[PDB]
Amino acid sequence: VKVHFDQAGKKVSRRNARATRAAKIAPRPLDLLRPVVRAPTVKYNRKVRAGRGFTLAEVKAAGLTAAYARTIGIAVDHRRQNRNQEIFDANVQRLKEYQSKIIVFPRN
Amino acid sequence: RNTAAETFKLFNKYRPETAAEKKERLTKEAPKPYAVKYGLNHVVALIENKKAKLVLIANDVDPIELVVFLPALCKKMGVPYAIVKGKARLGTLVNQKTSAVAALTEVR
Amino acid sequence: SHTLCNRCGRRSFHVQKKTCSSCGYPAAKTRSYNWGAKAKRRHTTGTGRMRYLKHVSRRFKNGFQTGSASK
Amino acid sequence: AGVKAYELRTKSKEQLASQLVDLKKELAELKVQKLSRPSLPKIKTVRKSIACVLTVINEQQREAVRQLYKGKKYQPKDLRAKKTRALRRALTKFEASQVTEKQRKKQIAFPQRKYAIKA
Amino acid sequence: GAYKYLEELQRKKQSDVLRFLQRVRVWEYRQKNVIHRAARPTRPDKARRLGYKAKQGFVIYRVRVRRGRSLRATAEERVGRRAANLRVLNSYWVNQDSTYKYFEVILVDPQHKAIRRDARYNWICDPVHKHREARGLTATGKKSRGINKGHKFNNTKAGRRKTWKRQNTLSLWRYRK
RNA sequence: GUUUGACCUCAAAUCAGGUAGGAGUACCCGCUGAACUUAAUAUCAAUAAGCGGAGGAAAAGAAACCAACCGGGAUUGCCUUAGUAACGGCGAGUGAAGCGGCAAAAGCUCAAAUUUGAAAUCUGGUACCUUCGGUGCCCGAGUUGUAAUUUGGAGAGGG
RNA sequence: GUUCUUUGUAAAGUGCCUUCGAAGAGUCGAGUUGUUUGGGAAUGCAGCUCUAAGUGGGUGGUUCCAUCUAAAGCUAA
RNA sequence: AUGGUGAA
Ligand SMILES: [Zn+2]
């Protein structure tokens, strides 16, 4: 029989790891900008949730290269379809807002 | 009998630039070259493209599959092809152990 | 009927069979089984001198450094 | 009384050998006389001196071997580090950091930038 | 790539030339030991796609297995038991007989400086890959284990023992649900 | 030229560089593999024990996937899905998975497309240097393919 | 940050025009005999005979459709 | 039942 007596210790360790990652990668937010996705399983279709990454078409509409999006903390999914237009427009607007808000530190 | 010897002697005047000759030329330097063809891959690439003008195929290639299909393709493309013995002599004239093929395009 | 064993000296070497029932001599692999809990504890490392294994932890803690202190 | 490493190391090989022979003779004499004394720290002192002399001789031999094998690769295993078998394997820093040309070009083209997101 | 023609020829395995070659090669192999070295693979098209390269370090073994556990996996384990210092990268059938099957196995020498410095192939030098054939991590081992995506392999997606332990081991939290 | 020089195969070296044994085994990966107890066979149980191989984690991992909606989108771990579907003397019992919520997220490398206007690649020996390696030279592997771009997420030839 | 330095007709990509653009075979699969499994229409796996194609093939839901490109490999959390 | 031991 397994008992999760360590729950508190695991939570503390996770918090410490998050703090260490924040210290290491301070400029970044420790996560990646991700799209807004409508769920399958009509029982949950009305629910709107995030996705793995933006599509290649979405990246092209945003006007940046896929590799540049990868290095600028934008998650890109190369296998996601584009069978909707409202979601595509929302993702494009979100990507544009994120790109406008971000500031890139130069080597100077 | 003597035909093979004469062919090998003629090919000895089309010897590919060996490592020593390449090093000597580079040192001296510190109108494209014409030489026989040895690599099977690029020989086959020239075949079916008609850049090849003469082909000799080794008769004692252990992977007989490597040479069974070559005569058929040569006949289909009309490129003069023949069977040749003496893989040791082929290697000597190619500046390698063996080549299994000897093709020529820019015959003077 | 038995005799001292070179590998272990447990005095469980059969003359008529030329083998040790305790440690499995002269078998290349030392005899061991899961059902023998007490035997496993008896034959497990740390019961002997551990001439070399003792300092492995110290060497790891020191990082396998080389040379000498510069005072 | 006794000997010191910083003094012994300055002597030559022949001098060290002569000192070792003399100390061995003294140790033998003290062992013979042991049956006529209740205490004998002198024997312990000479034993420690002999041990120090032998250690100095071994160090001199090892440094001579190291000088002989200096520079040339594939030196005798006795000089190589005994870190562990698992560390003799586990390819060294250069091999581990080696990267293919395609990956190097991709990384140079698109390096991982650093950026804050507040404005 | 000339290897495409060789692959196309090998696709029609029932050709007269291929039958001749197979019946010659089986007899030729029957005169040699059960497991032996080979200078180069007899199926370069297979070897190239399986990852074999002409550079130093790679080794080719030919192994005969009695006909009548995957035969490829058994051959890989047998060759690994002999070539302890080698890592069995891949294996593939090359000939068969009424009572014997012939497999050509490609292995890599992790101790070779070429492989060690080859970033594209130095991954096998990791000790985690030691005795890869013994754990069925090769293609044949994975196929035998049935670790593939899809409903067909749901019950063995992460090992039968692991899934049994996970689905038959009770778990309790500090606060009961 | 009844020599000689090459390639292929097989052998010898107390020649140079190494590698594998075994132990340990709580966790991992495969093979083999029982019994009592229960409504040979379901069940016990794909457990007990035996065999082989790894690390600090292992395995798996970026779909020939999940779904039938205006679709999702590596693997792994937890609540729920659930004691439901389903299986099963429909009894006794066995028994999941998509979706939903959270922890952490990173994708890449080849067979494949002549470099043929230049085997350009790489292993090893020696002399040096600023020695987890670099340069000059030599030797060897390699054309039965070592170099470079690239894997449909595409990609390449020209403007 | 000290700043040491450099090169090289340097390398890659973006947008348009534009000519091309090969998908891993004794392998999937089918039939048989066994192993395992509560496996839904004996699956997963092995032995046995056969073993196919490229705008083609695999998995599913109604004859038609939806979805991916296996039979090669690596990867911390 | 599994794995080993000695043996007129
Ligand atoms: Zn013993």
Q: Could you tell me if D35 and D79 are in contact, meaning their C-beta atoms sit under 8 angstroms apart?
A: no
Residue among E136, E68, E79, E129 at smallest CA distance from E103: E79
E143 touches strand G (CB under 7 A): yes
E1-177 fold: Ribosomal protein L15e (3.40.1120)
Strand C19-20 versus strand E35-38 pairing type: unpaired
- Contact in structure between C36 and D53 (CB atoms under 8 Å): no
| C68 at D interface, C-beta within 8 A | no
Resolution for this PDB entry, in angstroms: 3.9
Burial call E109-146: b when 16+ CB within 10 Å, e when fewer:
bbebeebbebbebbebbeeebeebbeebbbebbeeebe
Does residue D115 belong to the interface with chain A, where contact is any CB pair within 8 Å?
Answer: yes
Contact residues for A77 (Cβ-Cβ < 8 A; gap 6+): A35, A51, A52, A53, A54, A55
- Smallest CA–CA separation between E99 and chain B, in Å? 25
How far, in Å, CA of E177 to CA of E175, rounded? 6
Contact B68 E9 (CB under 8 A): yes
Kind and range of the H or E run holding E66: strand E58-66
CA pair distance E122, E139, nearest whole angstrom = 19
C-alpha angle E11-E16-E19 in degrees, rounded to nearest 5: 75
Q: Where are the domains of chain D?
A: 1-73, 74-119
> Helix, strand, or coil here: E64?
strand
Find the residue closest to F63 using CA and C1' atoms.
E149
Domain boundaries, chain E: 1-177
User: Which of C53, C26, D92, B65 lies closest to E3 in space, CA to CA?
Assistant: B65
| Tokens coding E29 | 């192999």
User: Residue A71, class by beta-carbon neighbours within 10 Å (0-12 exposed, 13-18 middle, 19+ buried)?
Assistant: middle
Side chain identity, residue B3 = T
Strand partners, E35: E63
Q: Where are the alpha helices (DSSP H) in A25-83?
A: 56-62, 66-71
Alpha helices in E88-159 (DSSP H): 113-117, 139-145
Architecture of domain D74-119: Helix non-globular (6.10)
- On whether the CB atoms of residues A80 and A74 are closer than 8 A, the answer is no
Task: Give the separation between CA D113 and CA A70, rounded to whole angstroms.
Answer: 10
Is C23 part of any known ligand binding site?
Answer: yes
Say how far A89 CA is from F9 C1', in Å: 71
Residue appearing with tokens 């945003």? A62
Q: How far is the CA of C12 from the centre of ligand 1 (A)?
A: 6
Among E1, E10, E18, the residue with its CB nearest the CB of B41 is E1
| Residue from A52, D84, B65 nearest C64 by CA | D84
d(CA A64, CA A71): 11
CB contact under 8 A, A2 and E172: yes
Which nucleotides in chain G lie less than 7 Å from some protein C-beta? 11-15, 22, 24-28, 36-39, 43-49, 51-52, 54, 59-60, 67-69, 71-75
CA A92 – CA A98 distance, rounded (Å): 10
In angstroms, the CA A42 to CA B72 distance is: 60
